[PDB]
Structure formats: structure tokens, C-alpha cells
Scaffold this active site. Structure first.
Site, short mmCIF file in Angstrom:
data_model
loop_
_atom_site.label_atom_id
_atom_site.label_comp_id
_atom_site.label_asym_id
_atom_site.label_seq_id
_atom_site.Cartn_x
_atom_site.Cartn_y
_atom_site.Cartn_z
N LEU A 13 23.89 145.07 32.75
CA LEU A 13 24.16 143.64 33.05
C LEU A 13 25.39 143.11 32.29
O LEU A 13 26.08 142.19 32.77
CB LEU A 13 22.88 142.85 32.69
CG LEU A 13 21.64 143.13 33.50
CD1 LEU A 13 20.38 142.51 32.96
CD2 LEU A 13 21.80 142.72 34.96
N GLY A 14 25.68 143.64 31.11
CA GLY A 14 26.88 143.29 30.28
C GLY A 14 26.84 143.94 28.90
O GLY A 14 25.75 144.46 28.51
N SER A 15 28.00 143.97 28.20
CA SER A 15 28.19 144.44 26.79
C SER A 15 29.20 143.58 26.04
O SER A 15 30.11 142.99 26.66
CB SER A 15 28.71 145.94 26.69
OG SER A 15 30.13 146.07 27.00
N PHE A 18 27.46 141.30 21.05
CA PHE A 18 26.00 141.36 20.91
C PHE A 18 25.34 142.78 21.10
O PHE A 18 24.17 142.98 20.78
CB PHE A 18 25.40 140.41 21.95
CG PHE A 18 25.85 140.68 23.37
CD1 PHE A 18 25.28 141.74 24.15
CD2 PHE A 18 26.89 139.90 23.94
CE1 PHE A 18 25.75 141.96 25.47
CE2 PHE A 18 27.33 140.12 25.25
CZ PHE A 18 26.75 141.17 26.00
N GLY A 19 26.10 143.71 21.67
CA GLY A 19 25.57 145.06 22.09
C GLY A 19 25.76 145.35 23.60
O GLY A 19 26.79 144.91 24.19
N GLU A 86 12.43 139.31 28.80
CA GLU A 86 12.20 138.79 30.12
C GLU A 86 13.38 138.84 30.98
O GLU A 86 14.48 138.66 30.51
CB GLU A 86 11.74 137.33 30.10
CG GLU A 86 10.45 137.13 29.40
CD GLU A 86 9.95 135.68 29.60
OE1 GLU A 86 10.62 134.73 29.12
OE2 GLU A 86 8.92 135.53 30.31
N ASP A 132 24.93 129.76 18.96
CA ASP A 132 25.86 130.15 19.96
C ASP A 132 25.50 129.61 21.35
O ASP A 132 25.48 130.31 22.38
CB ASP A 132 25.96 131.70 19.91
CG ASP A 132 27.23 132.20 20.58
OD1 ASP A 132 28.21 131.40 20.77
OD2 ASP A 132 27.26 133.35 20.90
#
Ligand SMILES: O=C(Nc1cnccc1O[C@H]1CCNC1)c1csc(-c2c(F)cccc2F)n1
Length: 270
Positions: A13-15, A18-19, A86, A132
């Protein structure tokens, strides 16, 4: 008990800072989830129940109220933690939503902003400061018209004394951070909420450079009602103590007569 055996992993989904975050399904009952990996070397904040402070914060806010994406489980590996979160479906982050629609109609922004305020209040009530708050960290459950906060990885325990560390998003950070590397939690959160509300009603953030943040003169690039402008400018008061409390925001004339989330989906999202 292997991550492998409880979850089918889907696409990324994304990087970023945050990781890395993947879509997944829980095998037991097909529950949609998100699976977030954080490398231990990248973690600077730690806590105890030894885990990332992020897991502490999440567990604090995850007892049921639906305005935060809940932590369902977590795993420790030799070099990382894996968080199971979730996943609403269908879902869209608020950055994408605003990118697609442009500036939001005020009725819609009122509904979204109100739900963000309720979610932030929940975090603070649980003893958690997100640090944030921004469009990218708000997910819209499109079917129910419900907003949910993500990414506690820059958050902190809520306290009443000064914070001298910050690793959230600079263009959402307040002028006291920029000038003095010091802020208090609540008033810093209200500044970010002003940036957020401007972004909703204008379709972009009001400030790009440090000098603009510290000057704090707000220019409106789209048509925005006088009451909305007044709320924004109050949230974006240069002096922290001149900003409204959450109670004052929620009592503001602009915030009256909010739609319910389901109404919001039937009107603006269906
Ligand atoms: O915790 C979440 N996400 C996250 C956490 N901590 C850090 C970043 C996180 O998100 C990253 C992926 C999307 N952009 C940022 C999360 C759960 S559901 C989901 C999500 C989705 F199901 C569809 C599209 C985009 C989504 F975000 N996200």
C-alpha cells in the site's frame, strides 16, 4: 503463530519514513487487514508493556472507538516488528481524496474535520499525542463516511510539559517548533488541525517555507466562508496560548449542525 500462517499477504500500500505497509487478509475469518513492517534499526523511540513506542500508543487507543485504525496483533522478528492493523474496504486516504476532488465543499469539510477532532480527542483521552495529523494520515471508510487516523509512528505519550523532539511533518509543525525547537502537545495539535482544515477547504496547505510558517499570515486561494476563515486563523495563531482549545473549536459557529458520518457518505461519497 507464524505471520505466514495467519495472514495472506497482498500488495504493498506504501513505504517511507514509517516503514512498509501491505494489504492482507486474516486467514481465520477473511478479515481485511494491513500489515506494517518497521525495522528495529530505524526505531528511535522505544517503550514497554520491550516494543516500539508505536505499539504502546496503538494499544492505548485501540480499545474500540472507531476514529483510529486499531492494532489487532503484532509480532517480533529478529530485525523488525510487524503490526497487524484494521483495513476498511473500500478506503481512500484524504490526500488522494482531496487530490481528486480539489477543495471540499464546506459541509463535507465540516463533517470530516469534526470527525478528526473527535478522533484526536480520543487519542488525548487515552494519553496519546499523534504529532503527525495530516491528510495522508487520515483514511476515509467510504461506505460508512467514517474517518480513521493512521500512523502513530511519530507519536508520544501526552504530557503537560515541553516537547523538544519532533519527527512529524514540517509543514504541519508550528512556529514555536520552527523558531525554538519547543512546543506543547495540545497547542501544537491545534496548529496542525488549522493546516488540515485549510487543506480541506482550499485543496492545498497554506505554508511551504519556514518563513511563511513563522510569519503566519494566511492567504485564501479559494472561496472560503468568513466563519471558516476565522476558525482557521484562530487555530493558526502564532502564540500557542492564543489558539483555541478543542472545546472552543467544537463550539465555533462554523462547526454547528454537522452531518452524521452515514449522511455524509449518502450525500458526498455514494
Ligand atoms: O495503518 C494504516 N496505514 C499506515 C500506518 N502507518 C504508517 C503508514 C500507513 O499507511 C501508509 C500506506 C498508505 N500511505 C501511508 C492502514 C491501514 S489500512 C491502510 C490503507 C488502505 F487500506 C488502503 C489505502 C491506503 C491505506 F493507507 N492503511
Amino acid at each position: 503463530e507464524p505471520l505466514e500462517s495467519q495472514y495472506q499477504v497482498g500488495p504493498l500500500l506504501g513505504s517511507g519514513g514509517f516503514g512498509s505497509v501491505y494489504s492482507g487478509i486474516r486467514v481465520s475469518d477473511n478479515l481485511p487487514v494491513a500489515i506494517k513492517h518497521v525495522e528495529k534499526d530505524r526505531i528511535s523511540d522505544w517503550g514497554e508493556l520491550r516494543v516500539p513506542m508505536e505499539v504502546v500508543l496503538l494499544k492505548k487507543v485501540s480499545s474500540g472507538f472507531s476514529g483510529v485504525i486499531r492494532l489487532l496483533d503484532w509480532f517480533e522478528r529478529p530485525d523488525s516488528f510487524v503490526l497487524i492493523l484494521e483495513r476498511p474496504e473500500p478506503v481512500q486516504d484524504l490526500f488522494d481524496f482531496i487530490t481528486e476532488r480539489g477543495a471540499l465543499q464546506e459541509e463535507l469539510a465540516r463533517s470530516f474535520f469534526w470527525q478528526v477532532l473527535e478522533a484526536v480527542r480520543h487519542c488525548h483521552n487515552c494519553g496519546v499525542l499523534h504529532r503527525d495529523i495530516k491528510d495522508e494520515n487520515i483514511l476515509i471508510d467510504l461506505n460508512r463516511g467514517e474517518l480513521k487516523l493512521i500512523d502513530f509512528g511519530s507519536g508520544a505519550l501526552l504530557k503537560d510539559t515541553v516537547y523538544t523532539d519532533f519527527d512529524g511533518t514540517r509543514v504541519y509543525s508550528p512556529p514555536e517548533w520552527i523558531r525554538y525547537h519547543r512546543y506543547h502537545g495540545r497547542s501544537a495539535a491545534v496548529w496542525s488541525l488549522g493546516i488540515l482544515l485549510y487543506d480541506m477547504v482550499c485543496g492545498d496547505i497554506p505554508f511551504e517555507h519556514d518563513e511563511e510558517i513563522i510569519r503566519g499570515q494566511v492567504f485564501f486561494r479559494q472561496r472560503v466562508s468568513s466563519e471558516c476563515q476565522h476558525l482557521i486563523r484562530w487555530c493558526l495563531a502564532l502564540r500557542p496560548s492564543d489558539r483555541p482549545t478543542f472545546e472552543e473549536i467544537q463550539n465555533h459557529p462554523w462547526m454547528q449542525d454537522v452531518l452524521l458520518p452515514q449522511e455524509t457518505a449518502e450525500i458526498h461519497l455514494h
